[PDB]
Ligand binder design. Structure first.
Ligand SMILES: Nc1nc2c(ncn2[C@@H]2O[C@H](COP(=O)(O)O[C@H]3[C@@H](O)[C@H](n4ccc(=O)[nH]c4=O)O[C@@H]3CO)[C@H]3CC(O)(O)C[C@H]32)c(=O)[nH]1
Ligand SMILES: [Cl-]
Ligand code: NA
Length: 396
């Protein structure tokens, strides 16, 4: 008997069912979402939220587009900020303050990102930040301090790769990893409102990663998550989502560390990319389904729900009230990694909120990064190609 089974029974006895389409495939994120929905459904009479896994986030956005063409949308779904911009073109989303959900106390980093034309269209729910994961044992073995600067981080990667005979900074050749280096070399994606993928800082960021591969300190991870590759070869560092935390803990045969990101100087951590999702509410939903969603959104923003979800997963608590919750404070008192995730969350940058950004980040930018890293494409050539494909897509 698992939470998916409890929910099936809850929804069988409900007159009103609000479907919540998500991209959690398993692990602690899926279990923590199901536990929240079980607790919510217990407090209802004749109403329930039914979580529906749609595969990953890419599959979820595909399924939502198909659902619009079919006229069969769920009540709620997870959405990135760019997915919100796309659904607003279709006038598909209900303004959250029209349901009367109170948003006071939501982190303005997250709430500003869901505001379009001054109107809030999503509820931050599962919001992640990049952190520096590291191998405490391996850095201890060689007396290497946790690097606080990008210059320190490259030096440490070089030193430890030479010592252990293989590349110890592991990375996915993807848009998320590129964003870390790009933003911390002073990059910006929007130049006077135009999307630019081929700026000098983009070229510098991709060149830094390609050079790290060539110099023997950076290891491209081509199959699976970094946490699914641990155990083969020496590992010192990765720059990866906070929502990876439980996956790294389950996989690591070494003592896992979590640090803030290396920055240009010791005066501030590096910026991390904010990922994970908001909850949106579809206009097509019934008034009765929308009233379940209102309740469910006030519940997800409650300090206890945030405290339990964040401590279960490594997601960033999205409210001030969550950090004052005793369950959150008890976990943080025993495990400094929670406070590290919160500190890092203060130094946060977003990708562009363009309707076309999901296609661009994977199929255009992500492909240019893979060409340069995996096929030794010249960085500037690869990003020049990415710029022209993005401009053609944005024109079309
Ligand atoms: N569709 C679409 N996806 C986007 C967009 N912007 C960014 N991303 C993706 O957000 C993932 C980060 O979201 P986050 O919720 O922080 O982390 C996820 C999982 O990544 C992570 N996970 C799962 C299994 C595992 O072994 N290890 C692990 O870390 O846990 C969470 C739940 O699955 C990145 C990863 C990516 O999927 O490859 C592409 C990136 C967008 O605009 N659209
Ligand atoms: Cl080994
Ligand atoms: Na393994």
């Amino acid at each position: 008997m698992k939470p998916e089974d409890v929910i099936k029974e809850q929804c069988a006895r409900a007159k009103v069912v609000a479907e919540l389409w998500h991209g959690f495939t398993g692990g602690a994120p899926k279990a923590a979402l199901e536990n929240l929905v079980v607790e919510f459904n217990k407090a209802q009479q004749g109403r329930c939220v039914r979580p529906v896994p749609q595969g990953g986030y890419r599959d979820l956005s595909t399924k939502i587009k198909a659902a619009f063409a079919a006229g069969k949308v769920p009540t709620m779904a997870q959405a990135f900020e760019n997915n919100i911009a796309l659904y607003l073109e279709a006038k598909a989303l209900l303004p959250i303050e029209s349901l009367g959900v109170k948003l006071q106390g939501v982190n303005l980093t997250f709430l500003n990102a869901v505001r379009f034309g001054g109107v809030v269209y999503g509820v931050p729910f599962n919001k992640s930040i990049q952190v520096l994961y590291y191998n405490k044992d391996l850095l201890k073995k060689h007396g290497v301090p946790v690097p606080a600067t990008l210059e320190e981080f490259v030096a440490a990667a070089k030193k430890l790769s030479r010592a252990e005979g293989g590349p110890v900074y592991w990375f996915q050749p993807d848009a998320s990893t590129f964003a870390y280096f790009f933003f911390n070399l002073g990059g910006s994606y929007l130049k006077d409102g135009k999307l630019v993928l081929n700026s000098k800082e983009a070229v510098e960021a991709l060149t830094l990663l390609q050079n790290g591969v060539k110099e023997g300190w950076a290891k491209p991870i081509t199959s699976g998550y970094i946490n699914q590759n641990l155990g083969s070869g020496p590992y010192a560092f990765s720059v990866d989502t906070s929502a990876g935390y439980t996956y790294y803990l389950r996989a690591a045969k070494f003592d896992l560390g979590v640090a803030t990101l290396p920055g240009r100087t010791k005066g501030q951590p590096g910026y991390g990319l904010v990922q994970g999702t908001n909850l949106v509410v579809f206009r097509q939903a019934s008034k009765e389904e929308q009233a379940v969603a209102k309740d469910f959104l006030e519940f997800v923003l409650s300090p206890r729900a945030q405290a339990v979800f964040a401590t279960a997963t490594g997601y960033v608590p999205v409210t001030e009230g969550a950090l004052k919750d005793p369950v959150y404070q008890a976990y943080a008192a025993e495990n400094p990694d929670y406070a590290t995730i919160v500190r890092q969350s203060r130094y946060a940058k977003f990708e562009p909120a363009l309707a076309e950004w999901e296609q661009i980040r994977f199929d255009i930018l992500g492909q240019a990064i893979k060409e340069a890293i995996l096929n030794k494409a010249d960085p500037k050539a690869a990003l020049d190609r990415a710029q022209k494909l993005a401009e053609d897509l944005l024109s079309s």
